[PDB]
Amino acid sequence: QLLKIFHLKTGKVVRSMKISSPSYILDADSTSTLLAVGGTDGSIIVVDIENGYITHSFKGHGGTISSLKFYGQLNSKIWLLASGDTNGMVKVWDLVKRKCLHTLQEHTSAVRGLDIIEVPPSLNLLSGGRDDIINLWDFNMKKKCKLLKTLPVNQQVESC
Amino acid sequence: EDDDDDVLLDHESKTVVVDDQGKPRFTSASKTKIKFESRKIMVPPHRMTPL
Amino acid sequence: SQVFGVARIYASFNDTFVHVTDLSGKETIARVTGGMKVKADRDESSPYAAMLAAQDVAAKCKEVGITAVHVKIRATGGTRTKTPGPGGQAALRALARSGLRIGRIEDVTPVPSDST
Amino acid sequence: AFYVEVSRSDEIQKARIQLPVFGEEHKIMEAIHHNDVVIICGETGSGKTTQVPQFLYEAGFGAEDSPDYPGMVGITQPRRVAAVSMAERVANELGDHGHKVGYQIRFDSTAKEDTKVKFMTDGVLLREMMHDFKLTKYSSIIIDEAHERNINTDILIGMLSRCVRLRAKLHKENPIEHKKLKLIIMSATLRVSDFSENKTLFPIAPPVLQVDARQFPVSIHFNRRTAFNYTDEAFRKTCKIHQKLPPGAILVFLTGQQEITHMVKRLRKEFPFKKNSKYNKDLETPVSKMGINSKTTDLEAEDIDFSVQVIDQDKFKSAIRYEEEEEEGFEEVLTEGQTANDPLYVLPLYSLLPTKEQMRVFQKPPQGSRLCIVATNVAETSLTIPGVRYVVDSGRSKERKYNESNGVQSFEVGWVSKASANQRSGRAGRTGPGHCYRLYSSAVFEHDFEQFKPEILRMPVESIVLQMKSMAIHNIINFPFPTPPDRVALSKAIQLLQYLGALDNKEMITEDGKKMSLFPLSPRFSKMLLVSDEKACLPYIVAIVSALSVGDPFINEFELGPELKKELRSKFYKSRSQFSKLDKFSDVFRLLSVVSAMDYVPKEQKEIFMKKNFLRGKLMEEIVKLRKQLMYIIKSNTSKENIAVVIRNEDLKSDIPSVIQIKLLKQMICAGFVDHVAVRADVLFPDDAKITNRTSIINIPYIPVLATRTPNIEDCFVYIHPTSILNNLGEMPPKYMLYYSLHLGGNNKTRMNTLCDIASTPLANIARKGLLLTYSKPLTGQGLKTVNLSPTERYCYVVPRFGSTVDNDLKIGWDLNPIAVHQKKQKGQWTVIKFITR
Amino acid sequence: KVTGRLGFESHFTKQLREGSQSKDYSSLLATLINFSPAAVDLEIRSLNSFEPFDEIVWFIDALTQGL
Numbered sequence A: 001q002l003l004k005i006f007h008l009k010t011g012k013v014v015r016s017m018k019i020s021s022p023s024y025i026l027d028a029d030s031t032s033t034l035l036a037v038g039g040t041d042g043s044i045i046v047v048d049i050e051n052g053y054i055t056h057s058f059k060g061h062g063g064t065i066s067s068l069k070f071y072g073q074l075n076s077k078i079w080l081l082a083s084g085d086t087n088g089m090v091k092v093w094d095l096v097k098r099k100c101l102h103t104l105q106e107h108t109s110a111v112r113g114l115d116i117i118e119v120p121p122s123l124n125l126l127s128g129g130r131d132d133i134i135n136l137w138d139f140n141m142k143k144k145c146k147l148l149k150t151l152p153v154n155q156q157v158e159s160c
Numbered sequence B: 001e002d003d004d005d006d007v008l009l010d011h012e013s014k015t016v017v018v019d020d021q022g023k024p025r026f027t028s029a030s031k032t033k034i035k036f037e038s039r040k041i042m043v044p045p046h047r048m049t050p051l
Numbered sequence C: 001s002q003v004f005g006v007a008r009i010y011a012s013f014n015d016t017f018v019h020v021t022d023l024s025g026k027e028t029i030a031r032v033t034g035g036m037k038v039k040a041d042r043d044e045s046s047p048y049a050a051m052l053a054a055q056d057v058a059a060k061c062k063e064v065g066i067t068a069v070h071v072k073i074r075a076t077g078g079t080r081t082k083t084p085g086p087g088g089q090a091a092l093r094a095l096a097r098s099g100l101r102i103g104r105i106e107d108v109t110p111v112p113s114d115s116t
Numbered sequence D: 001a002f003y004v005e006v007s008r009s010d011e012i013q014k015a016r017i018q019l020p021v022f023g024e025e026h027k028i029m030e031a032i033h034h035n036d037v038v039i040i041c042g043e044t045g046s047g048k049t050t051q052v053p054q055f056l057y058e059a060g061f062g063a064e065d066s067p068d069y070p071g072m073v074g075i076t077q078p079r080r081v082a083a084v085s086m087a088e089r090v091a092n093e094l095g096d097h098g099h100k101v102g103y104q105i106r107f108d109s110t111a112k113e114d115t116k117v118k119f120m121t122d123g124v125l126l127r128e129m130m131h132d133f134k135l136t137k138y139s140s141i142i143i144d145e146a147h148e149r150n151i152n153t154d155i156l157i158g159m160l161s162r163c164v165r166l167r168a169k170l171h172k173e174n175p176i177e178h179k180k181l182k183l184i185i186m187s188a189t190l191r192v193s194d195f196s197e198n199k200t201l202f203p204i205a206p207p208v209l210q211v212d213a214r215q216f217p218v219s220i221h222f223n224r225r226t227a228f229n230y231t232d233e234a235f236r237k238t239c240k241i242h243q244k245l246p247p248g249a250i251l252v253f254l255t256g257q258q259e260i261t262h263m264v265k266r267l268r269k270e271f272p273f274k275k276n277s278k279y280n281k282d283l284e285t286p287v288s289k290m291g292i293n294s295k296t297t298d299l300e301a302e303d304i305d306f307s308v309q310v311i312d313q314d315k316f317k318s319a320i321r322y323e324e325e326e327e328e329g330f331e332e333v334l335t336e337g338q339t340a341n342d343p344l345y346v347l348p349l350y351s352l353l354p355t356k357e358q359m360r361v362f363q364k365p366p367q368g369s370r371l372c373i374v375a376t377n378v379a380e381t382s383l384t385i386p387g388v389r390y391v392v393d394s395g396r397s398k399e400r401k402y403n404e405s406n407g408v409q410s411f412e413v414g415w416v417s418k419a420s421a422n423q424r425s426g427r428a429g430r431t432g433p434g435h436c437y438r439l440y441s442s443a444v445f446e447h448d449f450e451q452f453k454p455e456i457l458r459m460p461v462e463s464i465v466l467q468m469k470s471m472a473i474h475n476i477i478n479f480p481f482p483t484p485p486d487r488v489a490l491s492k493a494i495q496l497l498q499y500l501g502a503l504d505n506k507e508m509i510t511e512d513g514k515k516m517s518l519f520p521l522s523p524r525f526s527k528m529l530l531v532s533d534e535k536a537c538l539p540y541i542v543a544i545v546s547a548l549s550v551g552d553p554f555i556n557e558f559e560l561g562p563e564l565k566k567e568l569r570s571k572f573y574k575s576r577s578q579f580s581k582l583d584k585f586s587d588v589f590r591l592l593s594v595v596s597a598m599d600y601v602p603k604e605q606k607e608i609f610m611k612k613n614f615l616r617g618k619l620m621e622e623i624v625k626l627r628k629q630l631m632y633i634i635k636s637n638t639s640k641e642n643i644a645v646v647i648r649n650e651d652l653k654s655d656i657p658s659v660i661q662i663k664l665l666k667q668m669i670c671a672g673f674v675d676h677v678a679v680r681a682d683v684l685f686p687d688d689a690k691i692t693n694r695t696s697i698i699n700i701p702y703i704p705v706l707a708t709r710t711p712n713i714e715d716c717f718v719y720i721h722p723t724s725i726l727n728n729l730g731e732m733p734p735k736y737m738l739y740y741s742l743h744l745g746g747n748n749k750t751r752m753n754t755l756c757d758i759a760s761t762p763l764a765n766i767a768r769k770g771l772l773l774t775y776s777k778p779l780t781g782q783g784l785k786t787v788n789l790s791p792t793e794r795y796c797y798v799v800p801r802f803g804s805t806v807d808n809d810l811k812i813g814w815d816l817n818p819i820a821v822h823q824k825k826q827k828g829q830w831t832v833i834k835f836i837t838r
Numbered sequence E: 001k002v003t004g005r006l007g008f009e010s011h012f013t014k015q016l017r018e019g020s021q022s023k024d025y026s027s028l029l030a031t032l033i034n035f036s037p038a039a040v041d042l043e044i045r046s047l048n049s050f051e052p053f054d055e056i057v058w059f060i061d062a063l064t065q066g067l
């Protein structure tokens, strides 16, 4: 049972949806009006929060779904989604074409803590895990590659 | 003088248009069953003919 | 793709246990009883007590990630009732309702070969 | 108390000294000190849009220390792009004070804290004034470029006159409990007597002032011909300009976002950069393209389609047939250092741009690259480009055009006036002796360009008064407009909105009325497209309203109608009785099915259907152009996602309705035209009707609602048009018919524009929302009883009366069949909730 | 079920409106005395009592001119 409270003087339940699986990870955008939530099966719904209902489904995946992240700069045309996992993988979706950009099966435990930025579309991302590997990627828009691994000795949760 | 009878009551896209203040906005989502379970229960062969 | 736990539902006298384990048997997940939900000490073997106990176990096990449960009902065994009471069916109905796929219902109650 | 010390930078300071708006600042501020309503009659290129609010902050508006003027300052640009550009402009100008400048372009944006001299938008402060009828906050209000005569400017000053009257009345006795209100209006032309010296707008005569500037010689050049594709004409001309002419930037007055983006990418293709920075800058300008801001913002003239226009080359030349190598503007020499293939710093400027493209106009180009703007009316009076010398003008600006009682209603790009055209041309000789190229002939400029009109004249008064009701002003009959319209017509507009359901019997707008007022279209069609989101009838209804808005498609009697004429009329009637006709014989299902037939045809099979079944090519193409856009508009406003909707192909195209959907669309068009109903005269005057089968079908008399019934015979007795399916078959006309409009023929017979036929009950169900029908008492003489549930409920059985025959002052009206209602007893009278099905 | 020829209003309220425009109510009272008490209650319970009060002050002035 997903709900949203508008934080302003109207503190009423604005929208309420019936999501499929009991979920345990949410992220809103760096901007407003995008809320992504993925259940404990493979389903990552994303919701425009103003007129609150489902704007993307994203069946897509496998296993219960770990942490995820947006890519948001105000007034852009890119709008990616990060989509970690429990069985170690990162499957990046966009939101402007509803397509799996790149499938990446490389990890060994739950992919907690991944982050996306661009440095001059370059768009380097970085995905930690309950395994000790942070494993940043170059992540071009068409076809992507890998760079260094640089291995912290932790159990990294939310590697910002 | 012949009166009628009428009630008279009450896919996805691949593009964006954002806003005047940033704030992107995507088109609608497609629509979204319980299980396939089974239970086998044995019958002792003295309540067979009643079954 | 589903993964499987094992229920080990204990339909004891004056109490009811439900704790799903991964199907080896070592790593138990969310031991609850009938006592730690109700507050009366008279019906800690209540069917309602076992019902919300199995509901909380179903929530915690869906939080961990197991989706199906091979279910194994055990009565108190020994030289005693040898047969499940009402709490076993109560917990069985509860976690069969609560969104969890069920597999291979059995009976693992011990049989004595005429002990004392 | 007197003033707070201000400060500016040196170069903007001397720029303000050099521009002539610094000369009249003391006389303007003394006219403000001596009178509230001050008129300024400046112009573009002067500097009065920018520096006069800085003069007001100098004068003490925004100073808390002054007990006279401790309030806000609101600068009201009618365009939100003008609001943000002048906001960042005066934020640069006040400098160290520059953090006191703010903008508010939509309603969801509230006041930012750091400003006291804030810019905003016309509709923004009208909703602000609506929920604050007192207007405590703002000590002053600045109405700039009010010369445009917008509907927003008209409603704006019509509220503001009474607003400043009541505020000054409450202030002049006590400054403590009531502060002043300084109204400062500007304009571009000097015809401000309709703002100042109108006794209905102002019984108290307000002072008028001027403070204009200087201009370098503009050389205007009219071409020997006038081209059809004005985009290719302007593009060929501007490549020859940037190839051959001496340096000085270009402003291209063109029409819309699509054409402007096409010209900007073509200009960047023709004069490209090798440098990655400028190439990526042009890439960002081409990437960031659109925005709408449908409901939660003010609106402008970029609805981009409500236009049934059409065109050709013989049509254009027959419009300009009074006009009966070496070309003007091709005189001066190319200068050294200026290559013919120089890079061009190309910039689009339409109103639907983002802010990070609206700021990029005021950046200097790379060296060796010349600056260029391709734009529309934002840079006419509000904005001005610092550096242009060549302006080139297509002479066509998108506004509202609507002519009456014939189904022509288009938001099309007409032909701009002589005064506004010369105001566009006067941006050529602006930085130096400049060159304007008007993309037509001077004979065209003479003939079809009028000299000096308001949007309140160009738009229907029903949508005008609905706009006023959504802005929540109720004393509309005596409201001070510069052009107050016909009081008969606006009372008919209030009556029409009460008939459609926008206005109740106490004249406050309903929610359906506000959802009508959101539309940039007629109230009738807005009602249609609001109601028809029920039981899958929206493609049918959008086809019908697109057909009525585009005009008559049928080639019927603009031609024949001895040896081939008989066979051609016979095959024409066969084409009528073919796939144009399969469903009923009401009237309008043919007008649905000919457009449903445009799906049953491949694209290379285009001309055969028009050339066989007698349809007009450009109108039949612009209806299937208009259908996509109108479905986009109404899906955008009524569906749960505002902006992001798209229109696929088959759902605009077609499907086939059987029985429930044709009767449902019949009650939809009844909801469209509920006051254009008609009755066969047997049910009012069976003696005068002479109801016989041998009376001709265009002679069985029909009677409309609300029309006077004097003892003359043919007062209400208006007849059927020959161009329907009656007058072609005519067996027995059903009793209640619909029409769109009325046209009087030469035999003094007012013929119709008939649409459909209802028996009793969908007519009653439609009228229930309206304020046409007045109910009777519960009638249980021989029938079955009224069942109550409560002293405020009722399940009674009543006959309805349509045309308000209680106290019959000759407004003719008829009863209906008895129907079972479900009442609720509001405040002494029994309103109706719903009906009861059998 | 429906029943035709029940056109707008019953004779009590019709005669009341005609009597109010004709400044006397004598025929209205002659009807009102005459017809049955069950019907009298059935019409007098629904006298259209709302904000201009035309029907109810016409009835009070009718009983004034009656007695």
Ligand SMILES: Nc1ncnc2c1ncn2[C@@H]1O[C@H](COP(=O)(O)OP(=O)(O)O)[C@@H](O)[C@H]1O
Pocket (backbone or CB within 6 Å): D043, D044, D045, D046, D047, D048, D049, D050, D051, D085, D086, D088, D089, D362, D381, D382, D383, D384, D385, D386
């Ligand atoms: N946002 C802006 N940034 C820089 N300069 C501007 C801006 N807006 C207008 N200007 C310049 O300021 C000058 C004064 O024009 P403006 O005050 O805007 O209109 P008006 O002449 O109608 O008062 C113009 O020459 C124009 O080029």
